[PDB]
Amino acid sequence: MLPPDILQNGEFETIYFQTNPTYIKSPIHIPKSTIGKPDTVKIRHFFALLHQDLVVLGLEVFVYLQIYSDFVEKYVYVSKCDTVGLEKSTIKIGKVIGPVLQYIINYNGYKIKMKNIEYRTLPKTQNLRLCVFTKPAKEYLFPNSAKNPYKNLLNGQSLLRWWISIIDSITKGWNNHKLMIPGADKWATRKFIEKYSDWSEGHIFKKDGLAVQAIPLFPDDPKGRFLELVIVECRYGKMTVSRFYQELAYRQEFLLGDCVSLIGCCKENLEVTYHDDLVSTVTISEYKEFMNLLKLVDFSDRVEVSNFVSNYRKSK
Template sequence: MLVDDISEILPNNHQFRLLFIKAEPKQCNPIIKHHSQHSNFEKSIESIKLKYFFLLIDVKYEVIVFGLEVYKYFEISSERSLQYLFVSKIDTTGLLDTKLNVGNLVTKILEFLIDSSLHETTIKYRLKIKTSSTMKKINKLIDRPMSNYKTIALPPLTKFKLSLFTKSSNQYFFPESSKNKHKHLIDGDQLLKWWIKTIDPIEFTAKKLLIPGSLSGSQYLLPGWTRGSIFGKDEKCVYNIPNFPDDPKTRFLEFLIIENRYKSNLSQFYEELGFRQEFRLGNVVGIIGCESDWKPVNDKVGDDFQPIVLTNKQYKKLMKLIKYEDFSIMDDIKLLTNLKLPFFLKLYNKEINNTVINGKFIYKAKTAPTEIKVNNLTGLVKRRKK
């Protein structure tokens, strides 16, 4: 149970609410271009995309303290499905001096997303509507919905691929939060170590790290981790690099396609990627990839902590609502938490889960090591007269 799990890691004597938002699944283009000779997996019969968004709210002070956004992609074939989890953004507001272990919180949420996915035997998703731009405008004017939905049974086996890149920033989706004195800002080196430690407890068969433009990286690895990539070995990059949003790998692949160099192999791709601006600004940027074994999907009842499901348009409006706020002003964020967010959701007949999570973790301050007094015996030594 997610609520029980995170209560064990949230600060003792603090109360929180967890807002769990999900953008409805929709049909999309394949996450990786398929080629029978160069792809590691069979061609999918359907590709589906959805988004998850988590907000942690402090009950006493009525403000948001943490946010996490994760994209998920299904590549479904006849007997198996690949599920790609891409960690888009994670951020804290720094409004409160709360001893919140963000790493443990992220670990529990990612484990929850993986575990709950193993209990999904069907998925209902929105189909792409292929029509002219003129018809789209006409239907919009007459307020006629242009959506069509389909339900598909998921195959009995699934595999997870988790991806993220570790680029440090003062803020990610909480504007002006870097001005808050309680926000913990770290550089790229510290961020990479933090992510390795955060992902490590999650059960994966392969855990890999790549630092483009650097021959090193082993100093960051924990036992069980290796250097490299989970996307192919040394094959053509266009058939192995996934198309994630706001991802440096994807941007570089698009650049190579424009230059008609998209058939470069992966070793050449990552070598050239290291010369891109994101990796040459004097700050460490790592690419983390983790992969599970094939796991059976079953209809066992999973976690009863259910999301608020929004359409993709509603989800975008929600993100705009949050990103237009100034998170350095406490009163404004209280207004957002208590009035604007609930009002926005009520517009679409959605209700916030008001389950209160009681923190149980007792933070133990680090004590300074006891000073060991060393006896100075110099004064007891008799020196021979000259």
């Protein structure tokens, strides 16, 4: 997960846990009259880097397994990425995020219960989809950290360039790498990927038909937020994929936002061997309990942060 070469005294430690794999309804609407409907299994991943008693950064990633008879459609969605900045940075954040995200993408030791003692065996063929949105904000995970002396805030274009560099380095050889900047002319979007030969403009999802049957609705995703609206306004039987992305450009979040962007990469027909890797797994309630504790900590305050960390260590 993390290499000793970056740093290795014992100075830094990690928080890392997953939820127990949990069946959910598909984040992509599957028509009721469709054969070979897949089962969907979701796993939440939370990672934080600690230095001494302080949190340095955090990363939340959701993995969705669409399990078919002969293959898995595996979506990896970056939920949140954030830094604290209480101390002078001794390491480049991007060089921790990359490896952790790559580990999460490639993780295949999930203990999945049978669909209604005995765990389900997944198909060996997986098709990977990596989905990342870029949107600057003062804070995503760590309340009040924007006030901190060493928190570095990237503007939207800097943030996009940062994510492109990270994602490119961990998707080497993947079948595609897609960038969309809703509302931006294609020349402006092209400029971000001119030095990335394997990247092109657009998105990774099905191009035709209804948007709701092509695009996954991920939690707390600018794309998902519009999808939700389409569904509650019952425009879901009408709006195509192309029209969805056209109208997405005019959403307040995009049109008033700072280079809000959407990245998707795919790797097709990867043969995966199930590998047992023992990590801390928790119930959803335990996971949510942790996240709720998190949102109540003042991350501008060393005392509160150290206490949070102390309290976690005594737990497990």
